[PDB]
């Protein structure tokens, strides 16, 4: 569209996990307490 492009090869598909560390432990699952009342 009025701009001339240059041919190129397909690039390596990457996601977030390629570059950045997941700082969540896969060994220790901290559990949470129930409750839906605000005074409680």
């Amino acid at each position: 569209s009025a701009a001339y492009n240059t041919a190129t090869a397909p690039k390596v598909p990457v996601s977030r996990a390629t570059f950045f560390q997941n700082t969540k432990s896969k060994d220790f699952d901290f559990k949470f307490a129930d409750g839906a009342d605000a005074i409680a």
Binding site: S1, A2, N5, A7
Partner: protein
């Protein structure tokens, strides 16, 4: 692979965000003089039978 094409020989003027311009190859000639249709042409007979 960007496939090969044949040049369309039309005006390639773009006017920005309005897209491609309106191509008017012959202007008003074909509206006054009349449609030409150069694709079909007749070779006039210069010779003949005697």
């Amino acid at each position: 692979y960007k496939e090969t094409s044949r040049v369309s020989l039309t005006s390639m003027i773009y006017v920005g965000t309005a897209g491609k311009d309106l191509s008017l190859p012959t202007g008003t000639v074909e509206d006054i003089i009349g449609a030409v249709d150069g694709m079909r042409r007749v070779v006039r007979t210069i010779g003949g039978q005697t």
